Every structure is written in structure tokens, then in C-alpha cells.
Motif scaffolding. Structure first.
Motif, mmCIF file in Angstrom:
data_model
loop_
_atom_site.group_PDB
_atom_site.id
_atom_site.type_symbol
_atom_site.label_atom_id
_atom_site.label_comp_id
_atom_site.label_asym_id
_atom_site.label_seq_id
_atom_site.Cartn_x
_atom_site.Cartn_y
_atom_site.Cartn_z
ATOM 1 N N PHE A 441 4.631 3.235 2.812
ATOM 2 C CA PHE A 441 3.554 3.106 1.882
ATOM 3 C C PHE A 441 4.160 2.811 0.390
ATOM 4 O O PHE A 441 3.432 2.263 -0.300
ATOM 5 N N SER A 442 5.315 3.431 0.084
ATOM 6 C CA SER A 442 5.741 3.028 -1.194
ATOM 7 C C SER A 442 6.596 1.688 -1.149
ATOM 8 O O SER A 442 6.369 1.040 -2.151
ATOM 9 N N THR A 443 6.785 1.387 -0.089
ATOM 10 C CA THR A 443 7.214 -0.528 -0.148
ATOM 11 C C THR A 443 6.063 -1.194 -0.196
ATOM 12 O O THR A 443 6.116 -2.238 -0.624
ATOM 13 N N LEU A 444 4.970 -0.742 0.279
ATOM 14 C CA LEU A 444 3.674 -1.321 0.239
ATOM 15 C C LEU A 444 2.947 -1.550 -1.199
ATOM 16 O O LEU A 444 2.126 -2.570 -1.274
ATOM 17 N N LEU A 445 3.523 -0.751 -2.160
ATOM 18 C CA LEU A 445 2.741 -0.805 -3.288
ATOM 19 C C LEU A 445 3.427 -1.532 -4.554
ATOM 20 O O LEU A 445 3.358 -1.739 -5.557
ATOM 21 N N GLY A 446 4.969 -1.908 -4.110
ATOM 22 C CA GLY A 446 5.811 -2.488 -5.041
ATOM 23 C C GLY A 446 5.845 -4.170 -4.929
ATOM 24 O O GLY A 446 4.895 -4.498 -4.496
#
Ligand SMILES: Cc1cc(Oc2nccc3occc23)ccc1-c1c(C)c(=O)[nH]c(=O)n1C
Lengths: 446, 340, 128, 338, 57
Positions: A441-446
Motif C-alpha cells: 500500500f505504501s508503494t501504491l501511493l508513490g
């Protein structure tokens, strides 16, 4: 349109009885006379034209509200005190004046002489200041700030409020649900190390389930929330089956994942040996088989609009086959899991104490988190899905409108319906916070 | 008869001779020379292809001479051969021992070497047998786990183990041709020269020592680092090399100077080095860390040219191809990653 | 190179005291967990003490626990061990070893005399 | 064009090898790996494996196998440093370093002619003159005393018990520098670490191996790459540390001053017939090891102390129950439930 | 008694490492830098390569 009475009184398409009062139907309409139950249906049929056994169409309610407003304005114009204010104030404050004349009658509005003279002199702020400190705004404060604000500002911002609050309250929920579930549905594929996790084959299913609720169940009951009127005729007959299916899928996927965790904790060797992807997928599919065996049975057991409960022999049985047994067996599995966890916390604490004993020449802190992380899942589940079912099993037993058991009317029951439906939005926050999920999820927002 | 005293005195005088010889040969440094050169182009490569397949942790690899084939070994006990173009693994071959630590691809593309905790260098005829690859040779052991074996041709190989002793073998006869016993710690990394006439071994003695395949002796020695050397690689000219150890720095050692040149490290790093390589020219120095990340450095200004990240686990190996096109990397998360 | 030179040692009657020192060079002495290692004549290598990267953990061997005093100075890059109440069973050769891993708590210094981060120790005996 | 069929054949080979490798991953995910170090003999792992299981054959098979390689190595090393022995020596040179071939029955017929030639390892003349003793056999003591086989690298044994596959391996023949080869053990399920007490000590050497065991255990437990694996700690020599303690015959107090003011825990279960003076010492060592085990425990790896029992049938049960506990605690830590 | 073999075999190994001509760093780094400066055109890692020269895209 106006719809000023649709937010203060509500559109009740059926006849609802009171505790001691006589029968009423329509929109704030008191069916005069009719001391017997059959006597009010005759009045309803004579007022609507059609044979009204109690069922009033969505347009006949407005047709009767128009006649009620005509009677109210005639009674207000015949009254001398309320006569000049009609021509003084514009059509915006006419809504509030007719609302006051319909709520407390034509004789109640006439008793407010000082506010009458204030509104006649075209003074809005002074009229509001005088009407605030009265016995009318102290007994019903919910409908007050909706009509004084409209009379003071002179616009449609006072009634845009309820509609926009509800619109935002449902829009944020639907966006949160749909997006937080499609994020998992995309992360289970876009990332590799998370695909080969058979223990998550039951979580993704849940995701799919709790997304079908967001797209196929939420919007219909959402657009049903204007004021009690929806462009659905015989479509609820196919929508209640959708709802039963989408709720049963989740209510059984929770039980599936609970039994999966129980099998993984109780017998680790048997779990890592006898749990193959094929068995995992048939376990995924059997819950949906039961969901379509319970929901998509349209043998007229659901119709016995869109405002009546289900059949007795169908509600009290579908609740057992869909909720009661799953929740009971889930309690069993989780208590057994907690017992095993206690059994091993005992040995760990024994070793730690025997090692502290080496001090010759934190204790119950893990118990708190164990009980916490079990009670979160289980209590959220039960508090979301238990009042709904224990009330749906009892409410169809209500004859007329007076009873000693719960037998709560439709508004609080709809509130509880949405309260139980909102647990689909909390599914991913409780079942999808693995460290890998967090990194995805952290990689999906960057 | 007091011969040991005179021998020790002569040895001490000899040892003191190298100090003065290096002090006389160290008139300047590389920073004073590389001040005029303009900075390096800031480069951050991207992951072009990811090569999935392994079940457990990989440990080593070796680019083929065709810039296409890769050989990777995992803890699952199986070596797989890659095709970096199509990302299409051509075939896998199991092992006798599940614990493997180093690979080797032949410069001709005919043999494949494998080494590990089994203390056996297993050579496989990649192209012979008219079918599945068969076990060609199992070179004799020497009480040490194989940390690096490399091919200089198809007729003989060179291996290094943890017994502080390397061995140049002869595959045809399968016996030790030359033994190298000049270390006090685990011999870990090897790197042949462009002429394949000598190599330099990096071991746990915090020292890199140059050998010779002909005489089998040590011509020079380098004792710059502080901890166990893990990786080493020649500059593509045969006159210098780079060493990477657990002291979180990579150092450049020249042969004709017999002295350290430059050190490559930062203050916000502590992770030891796991794999060092160059490019085709030799200006970019590729160093894998244990912070789940690797760095490309400048081999002339000691500035961090850039970072290469994308492994959720510690990187294990990295290697450049022949024409300097791609930089393959490989971490313990069963993942290889090609960069360009 | 990384040299570790030990000083001190010598003959002393049983019951006396003796201080000995270790000077290390070639590396950053401040950030390394260090320690000593004894070897009795005709016996395997044995452990005595330990120093953290700052002086926090001062682990001793139960055979010498509370009797020897170890310290070190990171500024001068030196490490001292002082033996008080020397016993006739402590006659041995003492090496100054250091752990290989920087910024770590794992150590593997006791060996079969192939460990490189360990210089030639000093001899200590007792009188009669 | 013609490249399409080649690409499709490459893809078909890919699909075949991937279908094999999926099942290989399935198999590898179900085998628990156990690391055995500490003892100076790998046979200690072959006895407990012989109580259930290809190890059921007699020990003469392995000893006779280590006799058919010495002669081959000697005949290959003697002729490599040099009338009608060309085609007879070509086959012998081609049979060099062949793992699955060993010695055929027709090799002696080709080797006897080369041994009879007047022109033609340290111990190589004794195992070469009696080349006619081949059968199926039953070696003597003088033959086993002269045989010098190289150190077996890793003793690897994959067996299956109670419908679960275990992979137990002993690491021998390696150097005492345990720094860079322990890193290769991270996917292991458990490290079974065996400890011994004092020996006869009679001319006491006084090595104090117990404190060295503590130091090695502290180095392994606090390792950066071993923080997730668990250690099953066994305490061998329970019988030697029982009759040697008595009341003042054991030098355990001189090597550990805390043993004086140490007491026996109340939650202990001494074996029926154990004196207090020996039970206290038997629990002191496990308390000293748990002093390191109970610290730095991030709920991510634990220790399982167990005393080496006499019956060899229940140590396997201890190991099995410990593996079950390891898997359980790992799964509880997976779901944030512990 | 004394091991007059381990130390005797090291004096010549050390003496053989000191009889080599050592070029100064001022001259040993010139031809070292010139190699990577005169062959920067052959290394495609000094700039990102387009799809025309990347067999991995
Ligand atoms: C009473 C009711 C229950 C319900 O949910 C269920 N019903 C049976 C079995 C079930 O298992 C899980 C969930 C569930 C869905 C819709 C309605 C309903 C409402 C709210 C209404 O206003 N008018 C109407 O006609 N119906 C049918």
C-alpha cells in the motif's frame, strides 16, 4: 421541489399505528374517526381512490400532501392573525409558516403574536431572536434550525444541509470501502511474494465479497435515501436476494478464515500437509454455493413498496443457517485458539521467571494484547452483525403497532441495517494489515 | 646455533624494506590528480527484468559470454540457467547437496561449475551428452567450503575454499594441479586476469593477495582493509582491482604501485560489502551492501554516483556483462534483477 | 596492517598483581567489541573477559569473575587488563583478540590458533 | 519465420521445468530442517536415524564402500606421475572421479595386468596387493587402521517420520572458525545444540569448555541473520555430571561463583532418585543458558531446554514436540495474536 | 625442538615480494585514468540507453 415535510415527517407509504393514538397513514395525515383497524383502511381507500389495503404508491402520498397543504393554507387564510403575514413574507418563508400550521395546527401559530408582528414588519433577525427563546424551539430543536435558518437567510441552504450531510456521509463510506478493497484486489496480483500464500486465498475472497457489497448493494439502498422514495418497483424483489447473497458471502468467509486459523494453529503438520490450493479453492467456493442456495430462492418467500419484513419461517431459518451457527462455531474456534495461546504463554512465563530466578548472588502484559487482538476481531464482528439478526428474528412477530418485546419501528431498524453493513468497510483494516500489505500500500501511493 | 635469530633479523629488515619502497613510490594521490576532471553523470538505473523461480535464497551467479545466459544457484539444491533476453529459464538441474555457495559459467559456454558446503566442485557438461546435463566431474575436496570457483578455459579451473588454500585443478584428470597455501583465513573471492596468467584472492585475513598460475606463489600483497574481505574484482586492464569487505568500504589496489589508492564509503552506512564489480570501461564501481540496497560509486572521485534499490532482502551477488550493457543483481529473496 | 601488540607479563610470586596492555592499530579502535583469550601450556584456549564498544557489558569468566579488572581507552586506542590476586593456576600465555564484526555483539575469537585478529600474547607464571 | 518455433520450444521447456519446480517448492515448504553441531562424531546422528528407518542396513556397508575408493585413488595417482596396456589404462583414466560408477567387476581384470607390470596416497601398497579379496567383504582391523578417507563434508539425512519430512544434517570436517558458514543456515527450522559437562579430568587439563559453550551460544543467539530461527538446547553427559558432583568433587563452583547462593526452582521436576546436590547443579546450567535465552527475545525466536534422557527413543519425541511448538509460535506471531 | 621450518620458509617468501620495481603513483594513476577516460564511449552504463540499444526492453 419543496419536500419540506419530507424531512420533518417522512414519507410512510404504509399505515402505522401508535401506542394509544388512532391509526395514521400517508405524510403526517391523521385518519379521522376509525377506532377499529379495518375502519382506517376504508378511509385510506376513499382518500386515494384505489383499493388501499394499506399500500400507498409514491405519487399518491404527494397527491394527498397537496390536498393537506391546501386545507392548511385555507385554514390559515381564514384565520385573521395569520392572514397578513402571507402577503408580507415571500414564498420561502411560506414553507416554514405552512410547516408550523401543519405541526401545531392553525390555532397554535396564532398564539405567537409578538413574532407575528415581527415577521409582519419585515424583520428577520429580531423574529429569529424572539422565536429562539420559546417553548417551540426547546421541544423540537432538530426541525427548528432548519426553518429559522431558511427564514433568516432566505435561500435553499437550510434544506441542502440534511441532504448534503447524508450525501457526504454515504459517499465517504462507499469510496473508502471500494478503494480499500480494490487496493487489496490489485496488490494480491501486482506483487509476487504475496500470491503464493494459500492462507490468503481466503482473504482475497473476502475482499471480492466485501467489494460486491460496495458496488452491487450499497448504491441502490443509497439512492433509496432521498426521503423515502425510490425508482424501484419489482426490482427490490431481485435486490433483497442480492443483499442476502452479499451478506452471506461475508458472514461465511469470516467463518472460513476463522476455521482456517484454527486448523493452522491446532495441527501445524496436518495444516501444511493437507491444505492444498485445490482444497483451499473448494473451501472458497462452498460458501458461495450456500450463499446462492439461501439468497437466490425467489419462491415468493421474501414477499410475505420495499418496506415490509421477510417471512417468519424464512427469516428465522435463514438467520440460523446464515448467522447463528457460523457465529457460534466461530466463538468455539476462537476460544479454543485463546486456550492454546494461554497454554503456551504459561510455559513462556515459566521459563522467563525461572531465568529471572538467576538473579541470586512484563508478567501479564502479553495477556492484555492477546485478549485485545482477539476481542477486536470478535467484538467488532458481533457488535456489527448481532443486533441486526436478533432484531430481524423478532420484528416480523409484531401485529399492528403495539407490543412489549423490542418490536422497534423501521427507522432505527434501518439505522441498524446500515450499521451492520458498514462492517464490510472494516473488513480490510482488520484482515489486511500484514507487513507485506503495508509495504504494498505504501508503494501504491508513490 | 643462533641461525633463527639472524633469519628473523633478515626477515625484519626485508619487511621494513617494503615500507620505505612504498613511501618512495607514493609521491601523490589520486584526489590531487582527479580534481581537474569534471564530476560524473548522476546515474540511477532501472530494473528492466525480474527473474522469478527460485524457492529459497540464491547465493551467486555468473554472466555468460553471450550477454544472455545466467546461472543461479539457490539453497533449494538446484542450479537454473537463465536467458536474460526472453526472461525464459532454459532448464534447471538438481544437486546432491542442498547447500550451494558459488557458481561458474565457462567462457566457451560448454561447462558449468558448482561449489558449496559439500566441499566438492561439481563440473557439468552443459552442451554434451546429447541431452540433459550430466555430472562431468566431482573435484576432490580440501577440508573447506567452496566460496568461489572460476573457469579460465575448459581444460582446467581454479577454486578457493575455507581451508585458507586455493587450488588450480585439471578437469581432464580431476586432480590438484597447483595448491596455494598462503592464507590464515577463509579464502572467499577469486578474479582472473585478462590474460588468465594470474589472479588475486580475497580472504578473511583483511588482505588481498595476488597469485600466479605458473609458479604458484605470491608476488604482491595488500593489507588495507579492516575486516573480512568478501568480494574482489579486477579493473578491466589487469593492473589494478577493487576489494569489498565487512568494514563497509571498497578500496582500489594497484599492482604496479603495490599500495592502496582510494577508499569508497559514507558515514550513514555500516552494512558490509557482499559483491563488487566494474563496468566495461571501469569508471563505475558496483557494490552490494547488506542494507537491502546496493550503490554505484565513481572509481575516480569517491563520490556516490547513485543507488540501486528494489530488493526487500539483502543482496547476495552482482555482475556486469561483457559489453557492459546490463548489471544483474541477486538477493536472498529468490530474486535476480537486471539493470540498464 | 591491523596489528595488536601486547605488553607486560613476566615472573611474579603467587598472590601478587600485574597489569598488562594491548595497543591496536590499523583500524578504528572505538567501534569494536574486544576481549582477551588465555592459553594454558598443554591446554586449549580459554576465555576471560570482554569489552563493549563503549564499556557497557563487562562479561567475565566465572573462574576470574570479580577478581580481574579490565578497561580501555578509545582515544589512545588501548585496552588494559589488570590481574589482582594472581593464582598459581593462571600461569599461561595471554592474547588480545577482537571480534571481527563491526557494530555487532557476535564474536568467534577462540580458535585452533588460526584467528588473525589476535597478536602474539605475553607469558605470565608464578613462583614457588 | 523459423524463429517462432524455436521460441515456442524454449517456452515449452520453460513450462515443463516450471511445472516441476512448483512441486519442488511445495515439497521444500513441508520439510523442517535441523542443524546438529557440537559433537565430534557424525555417527551420533546416524544412530537415532537407525531406530526407525536406508540406514537400517549394517554399518559394514559404508566401511566396505570406503575401501573401494582408496584403491581407485591410489591407482589413479600412481599412474598419473609417469607394453599392451593402452586400451586397458584408457578405461581406468576415463573411470576417474566417477561418483555413480565406483568399481565394476571387470575393473580388477584390467588392473591386475597393470599391477603385474614390473615398471609400475601414503597408505597405498597394502590396499593394492590384495586386489583379489573382492566379494559381494568383512574387513579386518589392520585394513581399517590403514584406510585414510578424506573428511566427509556434510552428513545430510532426509527422512520422514509421522507423515512429516525432516532434514537433519551434521556439519563436520570443517575448521573451528565459525564465522562465515553459519550464515548459510537461515531457512533451517531448528538448531539442536548439544552441550557436555566435565569429563574424567584424570592430570586435569582445565579447559573450561562450558564457558566457551556459553560464548558460542551468545554469538549464535545474538546473530543478525539468525534472529528468526530457534535453538533446541540439549544437555548431554547427564550421567557423568551426576556421580562426579557428589558433595565437593566437582569444580563447578570454582568456575561459577553464583552456584553457591543458587537454589533449586520450585517448578522443577527432578527424576525419581535424584539428590538435591546434583539436581541443583543440573538446573543451574539450564538457568545460565536461559539467562541468555530469555534476554533479547523479541517474541521472534525461543529456546527449548531438555535434558539428554537415557532412552534414545524419547529424544526424537522431544525434538518432534519442540518442532510442533516452533511451528505453532511462528503461526501465532504471523497473525499478531501472541 | 624449535620449528625451524615454518619460519625458514617465510623469509624467502617475503624477500621475493620486495625485489619488484614499483612505479610512482603519479605515473601509475595517469595510465589508469586514461584507460577509463579513453574508453568511456564503449561503456553504455554512463548514461541510460534508449530502446534502440537495450535488448532488455
Ligand atoms: C429486513 C431485511 C433484511 C435483510 O437482510 C437479511 N435478510 C435475511 C437474511 C439475511 O442474512 C444476512 C442478511 C440478511 C435485507 C433487507 C431487508 C429489508 C429491508 C431493510 C427493508 O427495508 N425492506 C425489505 O423489504 N427488506 C426485505
Amino acid at each position: 421541489i419543496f419536500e419540506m415535510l419530507r424531512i420533518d415527517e417522512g414519507l410512510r407509504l404504509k399505515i402505522y399505528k401508535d401506542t394509544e393514538g388512532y391509526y395514521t397513514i400517508g405524510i403526517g395525515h391523521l385518519l379521522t374517526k376509525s377506532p377499529s383497524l379495518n375502519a382506517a383502511k376504508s378511509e385510506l381507500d376513499k382518500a386515494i381512490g384505489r383499493n388501499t389495503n394499506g399500500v400507498i404508491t409514491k405519487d399518491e402520498a404527494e397527491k394527498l400532501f397537496n390536498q393537506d397543504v391546501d386545507a392548511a393554507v385555507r385554514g390559515i387564510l381564514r384565520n385573521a392573525k395569520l392572514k397578513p403575514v402571507y402577503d408580507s413574507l415571500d414564498a420561502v418563508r411560506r414553507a416554514a409558516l405552512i410547516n408550523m400550521v401543519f405541526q401545531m395546527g392553525e390555532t397554535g401559530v396564532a398564539g405567537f403574536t409578538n413574532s407575528l408582528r415581527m415577521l409582519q414588519q419585515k424583520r428577520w433577525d429580531e423574529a429569529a431572536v424572539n422565536l429562539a427563546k420559546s417553548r417551540w424551539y426547546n421541544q423540537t430543536p432538530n426541525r427548528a434550525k432548519r426553518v429559522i435558518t431558511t427564514f433568516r437567510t432566505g435561500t435553499w441552504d437550510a434544506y441542502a444541509s440534511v441532504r448534503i450531510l447524508t450525501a457526504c456521509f454515504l459517499s465517504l463510506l462507499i469510496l473508502s470501502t471500494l478503494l480499500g478493497n480494490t487496493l487489496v484486489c490489485a496488490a494480491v496480483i501486482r506483487f509476487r511474494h504475496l500470491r503464493s500464500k494459500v492462507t490468503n486465498f481466503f482473504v482475497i475472497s473476502l475482499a471480492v465479497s466485501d467489494l460486491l457489497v460496495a458496488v452491487l448493494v450499497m448504491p441502490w439502498k443509497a439512492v433509496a435515501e432521498i426521503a423515502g422514495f425510490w425508482p424501484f418497483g419489482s426490482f427490490c424483489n431481485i435486490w433483497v436476494a442480492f443483499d442476502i447473497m452479499c451478506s452471506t458471502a461475508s458472514i461465511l468467509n469470516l467463518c472460513v478464515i476463522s476455521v482456517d486459523r484454527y486448523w493452522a494453529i491446532s495441527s501445524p503438520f496436518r495444516y501444511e500437509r493437507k491444505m492444498t490450493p485445490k482444497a483451499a479453492f473448494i473451501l472458497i467456493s462452498v460458501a458461495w454455493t450456500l450463499s446462492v442456495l439461501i439468497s437466490f430462492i425467489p419462491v415468493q418467500l421474501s414477499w410475505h413498496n420495499c418496506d415490509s419484513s421477510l417471512s417468519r419461517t424464512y427469516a428465522i431459518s435463514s438467520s440460523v443457517i446464515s448467522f447463528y451457527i457460523p457465529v457460534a462455531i466461530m466463538i468455539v474456534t476462537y476460544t479454543r485458539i485463546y486456550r492454546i495461546a494461554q497454554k503456551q504463554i504459561r510455559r513462556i512465563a515459566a521459563l522467563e521467571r525461572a531465568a529471572v530466578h538467576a538473579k541470586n548472588c512484563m508478567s501479564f502484559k502479553r495477556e492484555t494484547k492477546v485478549l485485545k487482538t482477539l476481542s477486536v476481531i470478535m467484538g467488532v464482528f458481533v457488535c456489527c452483525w448481532l443486533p441486526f439478526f436478533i432484531l430481524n428474528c423478532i420484528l416480523p412477530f409484531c401485529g399492528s403497532g403495539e407490543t412489549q418485546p423490542f418490536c422497534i419501528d423501521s427507522n432505527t431498524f434501518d439505522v441498524f441495517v446500515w450499521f451492520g453493513w458498514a462492517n464490510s468497510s472494516l473488513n480490510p483494516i482488520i484482515y489486511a494489515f500484514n507487513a507485506d500489505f503495508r509495504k504494498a500500500f505504501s508503494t501504491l501511493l508513490g | 646455533g643462533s641461525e633463527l635469530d639472524q633469519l628473523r633479523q633478515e626477515a625484519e629488515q626485508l619487511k621494513n624494506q617494503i615500507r620505505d619502497a612504498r613511501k618512495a613510490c607514493a609521491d601523490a594521490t589520486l584526489s590531487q590528480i582527479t580534481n581537474n576532471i569534471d564530476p560524473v553523470g548522476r546515474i540511477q538505473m532501472r530494473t528492466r527484468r525480474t527473474l522469478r523461480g527460485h524457492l529459497a535464497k540464491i547465493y551467486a551467479m555468473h554472466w555468460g559470454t553471450d550477454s544472455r545466459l545466467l546461472v543461479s544457484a539457490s539453497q533449494d539444491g538446484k542450479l537454473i540457467i537463465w536467458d536474460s533476453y526472453t526472461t525464459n529459464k532454459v532448464h534447471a538441474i538438481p544437486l546432491r547437496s542442498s547447500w550451494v555457495m558459488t557458481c561458474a559459467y565457462a567462457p566457451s559456454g560448454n561447462y558449468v561449475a558448482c561449489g558449496g558446503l559439500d566441499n566438492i566442485c561439481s563440473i557439468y557438461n552443459l552442451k554434451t551428452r546429447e541431452g540433459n546435463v550430466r555430472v562431468s566431474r566431482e573435484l576432490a575436496g580440501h577440508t573447506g567450503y567452496l566460496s568461489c570457483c572460476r573457469f579460465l578455459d575448459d581444460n582446467q579451473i581454479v577454486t578457493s575454499s575455507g581451508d585458507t588454500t586455493c587450488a588450480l585443478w585439471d578437469i581432464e584428470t580431476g586432480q590438484q594441479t597447483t595448491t596455494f597455501t598462503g592464507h590464515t583465513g577463509d579464502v572467499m573471492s577469486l578474479s582472473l586476469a585478462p590474460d588468465t596468467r594470474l589472479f588475486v584472492s580475497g580472504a578473511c585475513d583483511a588482505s588481498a593477495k595476488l597469485w600466479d598460475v605458473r609458479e604458484g606463489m605470491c608476488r604482491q600483497t595488500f593489507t588495507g582493509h579492516e575486516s573480512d574481505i568478501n568480494a574482489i574484482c579486477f579493473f578491466p586492464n589487469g593492473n589494478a582491482f577493487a576489494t569489498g569487505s565487512d568494514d563497509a568500504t571498497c578500496r582500489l589496489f594497484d599492482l604496479r604501485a603495490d599500495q592502496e589508492l582510494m577508499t569508497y564509503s559514507h558515514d550513514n552506512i555500516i552494512c558490509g560489502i557482499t559483491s563488487v564489480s566494474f563496468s566495461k570501461s571501469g569508471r563505475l564501481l558496483l557494490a552490494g551492501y547488506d542494507d537491502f540496497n546496493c550503490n554505484v560509486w565513481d572509481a575516480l572521485k569517491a563520490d556516490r554516483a547513485g543507488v540501486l534499490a528494489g530488493h526487500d532482502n539483502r543482496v547476495s551477488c552482482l555482475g556486469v556483462t561483457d559489453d557492459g550493457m546490463a548489471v544483474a543483481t541477486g538477493s536472498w529473496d529468490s530474486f535476480l534483477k537486471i539493470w540498464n | 596492517q591491523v596489528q595488536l601488540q601486547e605488553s607486560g607479563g613476566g615472573l611474579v610470586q603467587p598472590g601478587g598483581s600485574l597489569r598488562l596492555s594491548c595497543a591496536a592499530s590499523g583500524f578504528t579502535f572505538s567501534n569494536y567489541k574486544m576481549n582477551w583469550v588465555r592459553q594454558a601450556p598443554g591446554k586449549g584456549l580459554e576465555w576471560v573477559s570482554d569489552i563493549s564498544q563503549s564499556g557497557a557489558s563487562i562479561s567475565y569468566t566465572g573462574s576470574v569473575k570479580g577478581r580481574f579488572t579490565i578497561s580501555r581507552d578509545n582515544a589512545k586506542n588501548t585496552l588494559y587488563l589488570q590481574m589482582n590476586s594472581l593464582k598459581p593456576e593462571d600461569t599461561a600465555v595471554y592474547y588480545c583478540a577482537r571480534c571481527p564484526a563491526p557494530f555487532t555483539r557476535d564474536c568467534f575469537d577462540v580458535t585452533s590458533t588460526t584467528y588473525a585478529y589476535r597478536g602474539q600474547g605475553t607469558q605470565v607464571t608464578v613462583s614457588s | 519465420e523459423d524463429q517462432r518455433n524455436e521460441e515456442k520450444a524454449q517456452r515449452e521447456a520453460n513450462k515443463k521445468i516450471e511445472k516441476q519446480l512448483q512441486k519442488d517448492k511445495q515439497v521444500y515448504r513441508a520439510t523442517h530442517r535441523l542443524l546438529l553441531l557440537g559433537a565430534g562424531e557424525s555417527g551420533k546422528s546416524t544412530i537415532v536415524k537407525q531406530m526407525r528407518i536406508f540406514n537400517g542396513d549394517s554399518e559394514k556397508a559404508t566401511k566396505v564402500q570406503d575401501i573401494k575408493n582408496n584403491l581407485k585413488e591410489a591407482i589413479e595417482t600412481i599412474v598419473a606421475a609417469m607394453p599392451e596396456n593402452q586400451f586397458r589404462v584408457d578405461y581406468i583414466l576415463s573411470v576417474m572421479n566417477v561418483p555413480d560408477f565406483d568399481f565394476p567387476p571387470e575393473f580388477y581384470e584390467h588392473a591386475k595386468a597393470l599391477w603385474e607390470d614390473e615398471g609400475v596416497i601414503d597408505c597405498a601398497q597394502y590396499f593394492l596387493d590384495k586386489i583379489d579379496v573382492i566379494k559381494q567383504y568383512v574387513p579386518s582391523d589392520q585394513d581399517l587402521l590403514r584406510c585414510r578417507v578424506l573428511t566427509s563434508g556434510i552428513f545430510e539425512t532426509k527422512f520422514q517420520v509421522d507423515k512429516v519430512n525432516f532434514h537433519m544434517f551434521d556439519v563436520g570436517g570443517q575448521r573451528d572458525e565459525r564465522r562465515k558458514w553459519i550464515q548459510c543456515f537461515n531457512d533451517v527450522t531448528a538448531i539442536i545444540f548439544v552441550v557436555a559437562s566435565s569429563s574424567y579430568n584424570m592430570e586435569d587439563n582445565q579447559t573450561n569448555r562450558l564457558q566457551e559453550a556459553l560464548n558460542l551460544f551468545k554469538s549464535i543467539w545474538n546473530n543478525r541473520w539468525l534472529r528468526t530461527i530457534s535453538v533446541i538446547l540439549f544437555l548431554n553427559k547427564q550421567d557423568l555430571l551426576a556421580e562426579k558432583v557428589l558433595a565437593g568433587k566437582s569444580k563447578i563452583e570454582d568456575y561459577f561463583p553464583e552456584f553457591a547462593r543458587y537454589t533449586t526452582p520450585e517448578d522443577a521436576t527432578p527424576e525419581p532418585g535424584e539428590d538435591p546436590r546434583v539436581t541443583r547443579a543440573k538446573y543451574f546450567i539450564r538457568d545460565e543458558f536461559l539467562r541468555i535465552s530469555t534476554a533479547s527475545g523479541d517474541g521472534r525466536h525461543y529456546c527449548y531446554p531438555h535434558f539428554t534422557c537415557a532412552v534414545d527413543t524419547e529424544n526424537i519425541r522431544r525434538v518432534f514436540n519442540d518442532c510442533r511448538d516452533i511451528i505453532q509460535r511462528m503461526h501465532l506471531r504471523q497473525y499478531e495474536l501472541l | 625442538t624449535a620449528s625451524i621450518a615454518q619460519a625458514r620458509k617465510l623469509v624467502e617468501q617475503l624477500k621475493m615480494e620486495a625485489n619488484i620495481d614499483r612505479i610512482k603513483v603519479s605515473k601509475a594513476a595517469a595510465d589508469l585514468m586514461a584507460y577509463c577516460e579513453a574508453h568511456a564511449k564503449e561503456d553504455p552504463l554512463l548514461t541510460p540507453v534508449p530502446a534502440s540499444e537495450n535488448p532488455f526492453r
